[PDB]
């Protein structure tokens, strides 16, 4: 399903899709995962990441 995102750590393009490397709220860093942008409902975090980089 869906899980709370703490922060976006990094961004890449893979296979033509933008992916974001996510720290999940309440999970260790070992659980960080790359997710395609369409998996996120994180408009505030994405715009803050994309403006501060």
């Amino acid at each position: 399903e869906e899980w709370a995102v703490e922060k976006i750590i990094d961004r890449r393009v893979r296979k033509g899709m933008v992916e974001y490397y996510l720290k999940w709220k309440g999970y260790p860093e070992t659980e960080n995962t790359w997710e395609p942008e369409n998996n996120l409902d994180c408009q505030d975090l994405i715009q803050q990441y994309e403006a501060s980089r």
């Binding site: 869906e2 709370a4 995102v5 998996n39 996120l40 994180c42 505030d44």
Partner: peptide, 6 residues
């Protein structure tokens, strides 16, 4: 502020 996994 949520996301789907994989």
């Amino acid at each position: 502020q949520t996301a789907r996994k994989s």
